[PDB]
Design an enzyme around this catalytic site. Structure first.
Site, PDB file in Angstrom:
ATOM      1  N   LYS A   7     -55.844  33.638  -5.247  1.00 43.81           N
ATOM      2  CA  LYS A   7     -54.449  33.931  -5.004  1.00 43.81           C
ATOM      3  C   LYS A   7     -53.558  32.744  -5.318  1.00 43.81           C
ATOM      4  CE  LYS A   7     -51.293  35.200  -1.082  1.00 43.81           C
ATOM      5  NZ  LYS A   7     -51.108  36.257   0.004  1.00 43.81           N
ATOM      6  N   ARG A  10     -53.292  32.521  -9.002  1.00 48.06           N
ATOM      7  CA  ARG A  10     -52.423  33.600  -9.484  1.00 48.06           C
ATOM      8  C   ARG A  10     -50.932  33.371  -9.214  1.00 48.06           C
ATOM      9  NH1 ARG A  10     -50.423  37.946  -6.648  1.00 48.06           N
ATOM     10  NH2 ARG A  10     -52.117  37.709  -5.092  1.00 48.06           N
ATOM     11  N   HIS A  12     -49.263  30.504  -8.212  1.00 47.10           N
ATOM     12  CA  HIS A  12     -48.693  29.152  -8.355  1.00 47.10           C
ATOM     13  C   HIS A  12     -49.127  28.311  -9.574  1.00 47.10           C
ATOM     14  CE1 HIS A  12     -46.796  29.781  -4.572  1.00 47.10           C
ATOM     15  NE2 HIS A  12     -47.963  30.048  -4.008  1.00 47.10           N
ATOM     16  N   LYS A  41     -40.612  39.227  -4.519  1.00 46.15           N
ATOM     17  CA  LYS A  41     -40.859  38.023  -3.716  1.00 46.15           C
ATOM     18  C   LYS A  41     -39.633  37.121  -3.908  1.00 46.15           C
ATOM     19  CE  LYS A  41     -44.121  34.350  -2.719  1.00 46.15           C
ATOM     20  NZ  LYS A  41     -45.167  33.437  -3.256  1.00 46.15           N
ATOM     21  N   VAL A  43     -38.773  33.841  -3.452  1.00 47.46           N
ATOM     22  CA  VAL A  43     -38.846  32.492  -4.035  1.00 47.46           C
ATOM     23  C   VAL A  43     -40.300  32.168  -4.285  1.00 47.46           C
ATOM     24  CG1 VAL A  43     -36.879  31.505  -2.714  1.00 47.46           C
ATOM     25  CG2 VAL A  43     -39.168  31.274  -1.829  1.00 47.46           C
ATOM     26  N   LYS A  66     -45.903  22.572   6.912  1.00 46.86           N
ATOM     27  CA  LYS A  66     -44.709  23.067   7.533  1.00 46.86           C
ATOM     28  C   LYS A  66     -45.008  23.771   8.829  1.00 46.86           C
ATOM     29  CE  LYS A  66     -41.721  22.092   4.295  1.00 46.86           C
ATOM     30  NZ  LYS A  66     -41.452  23.444   3.600  1.00 46.86           N
ATOM     31  N   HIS A 119     -52.903  27.248  -0.310  1.00 45.17           N
ATOM     32  CA  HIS A 119     -51.511  27.606  -0.014  1.00 45.17           C
ATOM     33  C   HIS A 119     -50.573  26.591  -0.635  1.00 45.17           C
ATOM     34  CE1 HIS A 119     -47.931  28.463   2.590  1.00 45.17           C
ATOM     35  NE2 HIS A 119     -47.985  27.178   2.886  1.00 45.17           N
ATOM     36  N   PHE A 120     -49.474  27.058  -1.235  1.00 47.64           N
ATOM     37  CA  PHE A 120     -48.497  26.065  -1.778  1.00 47.64           C
ATOM     38  C   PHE A 120     -47.493  25.868  -0.616  1.00 47.64           C
ATOM     39  CE2 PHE A 120     -44.638  24.574  -3.764  1.00 47.64           C
ATOM     40  CZ  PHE A 120     -45.196  23.727  -4.766  1.00 47.64           C
ATOM     41  N   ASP A 121     -47.486  24.728   0.018  1.00 48.49           N
ATOM     42  CA  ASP A 121     -46.607  24.508   1.203  1.00 48.49           C
ATOM     43  C   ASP A 121     -45.151  24.081   0.871  1.00 48.49           C
ATOM     44  OD1 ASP A 121     -46.399  22.546   4.177  1.00 48.49           O
ATOM     45  OD2 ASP A 121     -46.804  24.620   4.091  1.00 48.49           O
TER      46      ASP A 121
END
Length: 126
Positions: A7, A10, A12, A41, A43, A66, A119-121
């Site tokens: 994911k 896909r 990022h 989505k 952003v 975050k 995860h892209f934080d």
């Protein structure tokens, strides 16, 4: 059943593009990467660096996520990215995006074995 690692790739990773500002790149990529299915989505950030460099971020500066969790990592270096932001006029299923290329450090959450981004934080100017 899609792994978070997959994911993250896909949503990022787009290693080989160099989008122009206010071009059509986000419109294309947001659709191609299935982020306009059922909603637009709002952003999203794409990273234009070899997947490897993003993967090594998991061994660099450990920082707080975050959400307070501690398994976040900040890139030693800035990276080409593009921010895709939904336009005000946009109504699903028309999802139109502003494309904003820039260079920023990225922050990712890493888990698993191998220890990779899930995860892209954030991105930060530093």
């Amino acid at each position: 059943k899609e792994s978070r690692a997959k994911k993250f790739q896909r949503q990022h990773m787009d290693s080989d593009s160099s989008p122009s500002s206010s071009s059509t790149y986000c419109n294309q990529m947001m659709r191609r990467r299935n982020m306009t299915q059922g909603r637009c989505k709002p952003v999203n950030t794409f990273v234009h660096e070899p997947l490897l460099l993003v993967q090594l971020v998991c061994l660099q500066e450990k920082v707080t996520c975050k959400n307070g969790q501690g398994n976040c990592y900040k890139s030693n270096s800035s990276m080409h990215i593009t921010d895709c932001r939904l336009t005000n006029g946009s109504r699903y299923p028309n999802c139109a995006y502003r494309t904003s290329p820039k260079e920023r450090h990225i922050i990712v959450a890493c888990e698993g074995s191998p220890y990779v981004p899930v995860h892209f934080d954030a991105s930060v100017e530093d």
